[PDB]
């Protein structure tokens, strides 16, 4: 699929002394490359992968400035929405944002997004056309009228159409050897006879990138064996991810079940079994 550059912002209000904790992470697809935390002593934007350290100190100064100002803005937005929802100052509340841009075939913006949530549920999202807003509730309609009046949609559009895609191109060039190759999952099926007349088969896919993957089981019928103990996709810790799907089959019919794997690192769906 098309490459992506995105930014995730988490702002948490504190009851204790009126400020707010702001944490920002930056991703080039499924690889984190920057971070920021104003809990730190004299906070700065910090590198989190080797390649991004090819950027000079002017870049780091700028980024630091931009995220500090954004942090102040989210600090005031916390109070604003607290007023919108008629909530007191005793409790802690969260304001989250995720925005970003995908890189198109012509070298320009394929699509972009900017979504904001309050306390973990949709608040306001920028529509696909990048010229309108979808408000998730009544309080978000106030925000949306404010944003239509002063045309924040054009600011989001100017960012995602210029700065975002250009920076994403420069990044994909910088991290050429790691960001641009999708490594396929190394797959294998293990067997664990445990339950009475029941034997667990587990299909493992390890060490793949990007994170999206499909792991299903199949027996004599057509549907995915919903004899599926499927875990959430998890980071390996070195940039890749892993996953597995397990089920319990009678001791006799191990060869009647096949694990199907699908991942963009493979040109075709993979099929494997307990050998």
């Amino acid at each position: 699929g098309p490459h992506s550059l995105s930014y995730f912002y988490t702002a948490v209000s504190r009851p204790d002394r009126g400020d707010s904790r702001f944490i920002a992470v930056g991703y080039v697809d499924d690889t984190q490359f920057v971070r920021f935390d104003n809990y730190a002593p004299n906070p700065r934007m910090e590198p989190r992968v080797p390649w991004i350290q090819q950027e000079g100190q002017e870049y780091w100064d700028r980024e630091t400035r931009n995220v500090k100002e954004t942090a102040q803005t989210y600090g005031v937005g916390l109070n604003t929405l607290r007023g919108y929802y008629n909530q007191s100052e005793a409790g802690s509340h969260t304001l989250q944002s995720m925005y970003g841009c995908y890189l198109g075939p012509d070298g320009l913006l394929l699509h972009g997004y900017r979504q904001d949530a309050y306390d973990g549920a949709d608040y306001i999202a920028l529509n696909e056309d990048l010229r309108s807003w979808t408000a998730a509730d009544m309080a978000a309609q106030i925000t949306k009228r404010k944003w239509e009046a002063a045309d924040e949609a054009e600011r989001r559009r100017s960012y995602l159409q210029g700065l975002c895609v250009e920076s994403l191109r420069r990044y994909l060039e910088m991290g050429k050897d790691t960001l641009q190759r999708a490594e396929p999952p190394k797959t294998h099926v293990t067997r664990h006879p445990s339950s009475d007349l029941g034997v667990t088969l587990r299909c493992w896919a390890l060490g793949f990138y990007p994170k999206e993957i499909s792991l299903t089981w199949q027996r004599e019928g057509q549907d995915q064996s919903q004899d599926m103990e499927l875990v959430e996709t998890r980071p390996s810790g070195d940039g890749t991810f892993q996953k597995w799907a397990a089920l319990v089959v009678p001791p006799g019919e191990e060869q009647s079940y096949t694990c199907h794997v699908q991942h963009e690192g493979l040109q075709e769906p993979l099929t494997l079994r307990w050998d």
């Binding site: 930014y7 980024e63 931009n66 995220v67 100002e69 954004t70 306001i124 924040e152 700065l163 975002c164």
Partner: peptide
Amino acid sequence: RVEDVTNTAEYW
């Protein structure tokens, strides 16, 4: 050169 300037608020 990555981040969006979100001072575009006081708005939310």
